[PDB]
PDB file of C-alpha atoms in Angstrom:
ATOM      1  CA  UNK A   1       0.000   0.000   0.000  1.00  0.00           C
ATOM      2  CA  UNK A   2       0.848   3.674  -0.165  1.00  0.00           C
ATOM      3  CA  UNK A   3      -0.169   4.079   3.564  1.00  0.00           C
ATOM      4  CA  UNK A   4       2.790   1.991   4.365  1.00  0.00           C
ATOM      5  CA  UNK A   5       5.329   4.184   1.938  1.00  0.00           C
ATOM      6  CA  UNK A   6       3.916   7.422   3.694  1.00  0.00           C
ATOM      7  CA  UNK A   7       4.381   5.561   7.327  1.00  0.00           C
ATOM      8  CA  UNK A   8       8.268   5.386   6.232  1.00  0.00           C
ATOM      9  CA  UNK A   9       8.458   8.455   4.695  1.00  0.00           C
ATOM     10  CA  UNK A  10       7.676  10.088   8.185  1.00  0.00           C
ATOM     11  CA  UNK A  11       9.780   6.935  10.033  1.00  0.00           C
ATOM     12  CA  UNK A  12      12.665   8.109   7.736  1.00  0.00           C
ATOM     13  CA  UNK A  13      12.334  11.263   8.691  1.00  0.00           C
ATOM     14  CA  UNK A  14      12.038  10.882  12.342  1.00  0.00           C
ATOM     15  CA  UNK A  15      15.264   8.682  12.054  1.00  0.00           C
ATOM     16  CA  UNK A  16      16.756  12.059   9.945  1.00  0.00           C
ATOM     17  CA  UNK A  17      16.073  14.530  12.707  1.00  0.00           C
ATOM     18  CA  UNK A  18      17.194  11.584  15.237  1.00  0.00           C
ATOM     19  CA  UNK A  19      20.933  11.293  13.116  1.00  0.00           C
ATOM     20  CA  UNK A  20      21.038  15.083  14.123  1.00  0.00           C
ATOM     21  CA  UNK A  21      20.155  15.110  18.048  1.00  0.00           C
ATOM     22  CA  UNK A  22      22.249  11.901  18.484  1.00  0.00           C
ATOM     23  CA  UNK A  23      25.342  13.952  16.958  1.00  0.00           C
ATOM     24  CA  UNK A  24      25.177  16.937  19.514  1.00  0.00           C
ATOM     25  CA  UNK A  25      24.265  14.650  22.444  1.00  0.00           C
ATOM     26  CA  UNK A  26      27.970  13.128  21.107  1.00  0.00           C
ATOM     27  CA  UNK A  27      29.659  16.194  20.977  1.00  0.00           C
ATOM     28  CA  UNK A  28      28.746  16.724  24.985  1.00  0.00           C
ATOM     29  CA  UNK A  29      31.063  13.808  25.076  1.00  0.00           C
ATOM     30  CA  UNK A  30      34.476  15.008  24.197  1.00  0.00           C
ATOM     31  CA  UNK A  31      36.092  12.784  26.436  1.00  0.00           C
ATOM     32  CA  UNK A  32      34.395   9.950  24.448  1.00  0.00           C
ATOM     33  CA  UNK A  33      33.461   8.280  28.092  1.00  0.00           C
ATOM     34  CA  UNK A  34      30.002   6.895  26.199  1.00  0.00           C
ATOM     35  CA  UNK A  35      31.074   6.388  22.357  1.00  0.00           C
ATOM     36  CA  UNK A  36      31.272   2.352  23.311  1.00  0.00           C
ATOM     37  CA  UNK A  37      29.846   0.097  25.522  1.00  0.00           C
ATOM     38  CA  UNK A  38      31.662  -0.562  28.644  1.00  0.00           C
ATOM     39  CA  UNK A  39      34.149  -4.291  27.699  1.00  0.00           C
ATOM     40  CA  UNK A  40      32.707  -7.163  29.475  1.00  0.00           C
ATOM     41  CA  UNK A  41      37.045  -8.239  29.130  1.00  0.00           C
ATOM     42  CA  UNK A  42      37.754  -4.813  31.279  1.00  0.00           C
ATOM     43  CA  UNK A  43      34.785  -4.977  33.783  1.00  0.00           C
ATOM     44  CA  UNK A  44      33.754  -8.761  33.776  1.00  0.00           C
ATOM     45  CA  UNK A  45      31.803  -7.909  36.829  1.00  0.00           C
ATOM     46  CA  UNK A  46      29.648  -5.396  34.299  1.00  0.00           C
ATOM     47  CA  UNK A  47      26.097  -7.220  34.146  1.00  0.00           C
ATOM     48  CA  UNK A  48      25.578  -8.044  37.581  1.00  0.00           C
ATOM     49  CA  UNK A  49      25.683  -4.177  38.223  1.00  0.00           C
ATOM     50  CA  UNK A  50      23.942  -2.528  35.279  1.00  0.00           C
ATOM     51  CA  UNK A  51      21.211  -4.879  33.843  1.00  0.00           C
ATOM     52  CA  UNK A  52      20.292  -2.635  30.777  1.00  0.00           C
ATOM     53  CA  UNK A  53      23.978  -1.226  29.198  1.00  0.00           C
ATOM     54  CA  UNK A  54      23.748   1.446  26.786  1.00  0.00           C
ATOM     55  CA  UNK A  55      26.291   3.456  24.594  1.00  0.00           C
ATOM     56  CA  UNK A  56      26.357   6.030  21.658  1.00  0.00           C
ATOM     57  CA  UNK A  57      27.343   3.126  19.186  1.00  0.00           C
ATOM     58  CA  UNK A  58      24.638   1.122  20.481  1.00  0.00           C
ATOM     59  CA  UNK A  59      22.276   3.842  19.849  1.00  0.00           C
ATOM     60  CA  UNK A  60      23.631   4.891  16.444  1.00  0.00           C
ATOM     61  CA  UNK A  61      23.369   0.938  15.468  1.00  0.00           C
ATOM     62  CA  UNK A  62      19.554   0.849  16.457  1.00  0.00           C
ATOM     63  CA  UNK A  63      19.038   4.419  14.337  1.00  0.00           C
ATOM     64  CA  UNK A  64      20.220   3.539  11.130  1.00  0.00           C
ATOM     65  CA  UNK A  65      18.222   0.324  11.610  1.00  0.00           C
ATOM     66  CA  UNK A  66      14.603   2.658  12.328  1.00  0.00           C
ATOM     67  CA  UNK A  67      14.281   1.020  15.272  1.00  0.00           C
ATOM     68  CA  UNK A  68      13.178   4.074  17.083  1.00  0.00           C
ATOM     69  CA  UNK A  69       9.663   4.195  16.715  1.00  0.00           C
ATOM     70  CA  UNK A  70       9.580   7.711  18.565  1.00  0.00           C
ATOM     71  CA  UNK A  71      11.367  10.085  20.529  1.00  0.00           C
ATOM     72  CA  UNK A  72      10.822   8.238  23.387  1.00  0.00           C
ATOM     73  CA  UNK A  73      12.542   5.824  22.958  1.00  0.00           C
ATOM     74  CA  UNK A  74      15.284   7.619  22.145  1.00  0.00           C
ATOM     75  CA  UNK A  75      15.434   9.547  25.415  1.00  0.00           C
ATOM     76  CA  UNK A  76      14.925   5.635  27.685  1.00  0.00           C
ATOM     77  CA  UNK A  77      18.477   5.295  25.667  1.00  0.00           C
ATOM     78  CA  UNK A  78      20.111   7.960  26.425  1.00  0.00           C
ATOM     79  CA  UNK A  79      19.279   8.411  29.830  1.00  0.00           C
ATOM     80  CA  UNK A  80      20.245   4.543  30.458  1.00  0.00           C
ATOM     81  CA  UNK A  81      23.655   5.594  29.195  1.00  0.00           C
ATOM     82  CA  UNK A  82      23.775   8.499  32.292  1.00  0.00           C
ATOM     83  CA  UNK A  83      21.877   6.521  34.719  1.00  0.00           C
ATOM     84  CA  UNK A  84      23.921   3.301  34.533  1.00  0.00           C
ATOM     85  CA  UNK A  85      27.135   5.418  34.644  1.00  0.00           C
ATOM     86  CA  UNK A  86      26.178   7.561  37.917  1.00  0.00           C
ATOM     87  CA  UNK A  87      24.932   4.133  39.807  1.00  0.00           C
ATOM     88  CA  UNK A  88      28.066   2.157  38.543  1.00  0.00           C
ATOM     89  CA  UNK A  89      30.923   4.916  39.104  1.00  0.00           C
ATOM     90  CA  UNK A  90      30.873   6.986  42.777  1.00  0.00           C
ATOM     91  CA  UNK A  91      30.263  10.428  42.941  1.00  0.00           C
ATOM     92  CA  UNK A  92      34.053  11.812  42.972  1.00  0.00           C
ATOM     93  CA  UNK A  93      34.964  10.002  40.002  1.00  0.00           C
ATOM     94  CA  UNK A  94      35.429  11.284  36.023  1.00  0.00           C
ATOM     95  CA  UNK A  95      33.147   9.155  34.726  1.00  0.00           C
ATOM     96  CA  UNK A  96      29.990  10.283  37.222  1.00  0.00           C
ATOM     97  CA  UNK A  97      30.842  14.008  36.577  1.00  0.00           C
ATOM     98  CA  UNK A  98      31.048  13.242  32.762  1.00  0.00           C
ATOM     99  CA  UNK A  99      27.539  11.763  32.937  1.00  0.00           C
ATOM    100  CA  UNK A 100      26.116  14.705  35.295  1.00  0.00           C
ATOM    101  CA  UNK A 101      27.918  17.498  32.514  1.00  0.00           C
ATOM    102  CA  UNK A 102      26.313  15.004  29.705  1.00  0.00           C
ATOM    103  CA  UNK A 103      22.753  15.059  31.163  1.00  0.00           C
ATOM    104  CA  UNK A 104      22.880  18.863  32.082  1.00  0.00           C
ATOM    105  CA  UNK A 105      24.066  19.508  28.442  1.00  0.00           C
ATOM    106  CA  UNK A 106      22.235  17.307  27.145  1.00  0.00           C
ATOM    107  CA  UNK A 107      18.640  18.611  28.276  1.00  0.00           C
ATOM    108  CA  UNK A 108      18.881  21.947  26.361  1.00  0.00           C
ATOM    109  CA  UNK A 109      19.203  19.636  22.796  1.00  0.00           C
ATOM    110  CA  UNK A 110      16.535  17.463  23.783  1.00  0.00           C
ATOM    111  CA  UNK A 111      13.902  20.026  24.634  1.00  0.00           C
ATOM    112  CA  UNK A 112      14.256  21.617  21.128  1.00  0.00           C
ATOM    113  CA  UNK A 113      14.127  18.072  19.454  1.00  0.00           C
ATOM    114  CA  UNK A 114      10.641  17.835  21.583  1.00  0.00           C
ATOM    115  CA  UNK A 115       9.259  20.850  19.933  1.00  0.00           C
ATOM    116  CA  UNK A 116      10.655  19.810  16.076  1.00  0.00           C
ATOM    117  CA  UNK A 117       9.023  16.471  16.280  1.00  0.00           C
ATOM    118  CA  UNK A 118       5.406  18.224  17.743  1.00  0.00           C
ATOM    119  CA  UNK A 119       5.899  20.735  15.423  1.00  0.00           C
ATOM    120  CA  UNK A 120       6.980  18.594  12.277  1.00  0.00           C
ATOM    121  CA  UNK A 121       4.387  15.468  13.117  1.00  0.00           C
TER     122      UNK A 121
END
């Protein structure tokens, strides 16, 4: 059907504006801290911590597969990425104040990407 082209013509799209906010939430990550997912070889001990890991390349992977039905999910993401890191790392550490500077930062791109996706459709 042509209902179904139109559907992905907006999923597409969605997964256009998404390419974009992923990118800047990135570049609030100079350190590259979250560009990978934390080895399971470096921390064996990972999954008994931090049941649901998340990274930028894990994110990315999911995007340019339109697996992001909406914006929401794309925030549960990135907020698992800054939630796992301040429960896993203590508070006077470079990783936790990475993830605080990342989430502060971060909240500024994501409330305009709320209003271009209302706004848009």
């Amino acid at each position: 059907s042509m209902e179904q082209v139109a559907m992905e013509l907006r999923l597409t799209e969605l997964t256009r504006l998404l390419r974009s906010v992923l990118d800047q939430l990135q570049d609030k990550d100079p350190a590259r801290i979250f560009a990978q997912p934390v080895s399971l070889k470096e921390v064996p001990d990972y999954l008994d911590h931090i049941k649901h890991p998340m990274d930028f390349a894990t994110m990315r992977k999911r995007l340019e597969a339109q697996g992001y039905k909406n914006l929401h999910e794309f925030e549960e993401d990135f907020d698992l990425i800054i939630d796992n890191c301040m429960k896993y790392n203590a508070r006077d550490t470079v990783f936790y104040r990475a993830a605080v500077r990342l989430r502060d930062q971060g909240g500024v791109v994501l409330r305009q990407a709320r209003r271009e996706v209302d706004s848009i459709g």
